[PDB]
From a paper:
Elevated glucagon levels and increased hepatic glucagon receptor (GCGR) signaling contribute to hyperglycemia in type 2 diabetes. We have identified a monoclonal antibody that inhibits GCGR, a class B G-protein coupled receptor (GPCR), through a unique allosteric mechanism. Receptor inhibition is mediated by the binding of this antibody to two distinct sites that lie outside of the glucagon binding cleft. One site consists of a patch of residues that are surface-exposed on the face of the extracellular domain (ECD) opposite the ligand-binding cleft, whereas the second binding site consists of residues in the αA helix of the ECD.
Numbering used by the authors:
A (entry chain H), B (entry chain L): 1 to 217
Write the structure that this text describes.
Amino acid sequence: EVQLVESGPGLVKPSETLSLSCTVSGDSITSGFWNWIRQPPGKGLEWIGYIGFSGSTYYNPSLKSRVTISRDTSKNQYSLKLSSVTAADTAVYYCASVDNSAALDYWGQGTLVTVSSASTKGPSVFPLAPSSKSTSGGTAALGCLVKDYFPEPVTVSWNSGALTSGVHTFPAVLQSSGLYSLSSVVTVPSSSLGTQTYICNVNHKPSNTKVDKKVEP
Amino acid sequence: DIVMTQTPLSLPVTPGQPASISCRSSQSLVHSNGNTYLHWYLQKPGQSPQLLIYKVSNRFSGVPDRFSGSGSGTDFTLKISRVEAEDVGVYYCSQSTHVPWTFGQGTKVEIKRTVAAPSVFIFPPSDEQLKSGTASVVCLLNNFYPREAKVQWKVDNALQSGNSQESVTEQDSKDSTYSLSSTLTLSKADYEKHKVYACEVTHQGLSSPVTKSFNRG
């Protein structure tokens, strides 16, 4: 089954150069049409364009001739370049295949690109320790506060992905400082504290931050 | 551009009840080859859009039988005969007949489950963060419904304002609840000046407003 993966920088300065690439697995891009779509924040979807059979392309006129799509068939990759970006170009960018029905049948997970003149900044990670102030009946809650990073996103897992039950990772909030902050929390049995070890695994790719924080009472 | 337009934009529905979404295009989507390239996508919480229906009425892979599409020319409908908790997310109609391909605004389907009171937890700042000269106090409201919830911070019984932010999860695709985290941020010096920290929560599922608090030290 076809798989698509977007990659590229998560931060671009206004007026500078947006470049992303999509690596396709399970199919060859030398046949069929391959697409870029974007979605601005809490906004809906906009088709950007495709690259098709002979390297031919079509771009949505909405992009006003700022876009170029190209391919590297030897690596089964295709790429997007968007020039003279502004805040309006801040979005999650997806690559996707088209089928014979002309629908978008397989999509990548997408990658967020933020257009800003602010600098890259990695988060500090703090424990939200379980206590009598977070224990009711038999249940306790604990977590990690991921503070002061830019741009989005941060990824959080617990115990290297072993713990998924009861986990809530909240949307990031943009602080007045212009830096994001988020919390991930988990509800666990009070009876499990001191018996089980809980570690939040935090990843901020745009700053190369990778942190594992043990959370204890 | 063919303008695709969707109604309603927000669609609350009780589990087991039918739901319908109307999609209009500004021009006929009948292609000269005789096909009608109208499609529907579903974007579930925290993931990429996925193809639901193609060519108006054709169900894509793994799409449960409860979903059906109909219509012709410029007037289309998506019907869910009995909604399930897993159907929560944003539904988009889209046209492929003419370039550029375009999408509707998206319809947010919300599941109207039973009222559930939040479990409330409070977390003092970590001594790790207190080093840094800042203090984040976190209030957690877990697994509640409906979304409407009021949180207010009180420090030594003093109403706080302008020093807190909230984040709330998307409705859970399994239990249809929301969770919310509210963070109160002070300087270390300020935090060190006061004694009782409290978050008072108001919600339909509570018998009265609930307050969780702690004494500094």
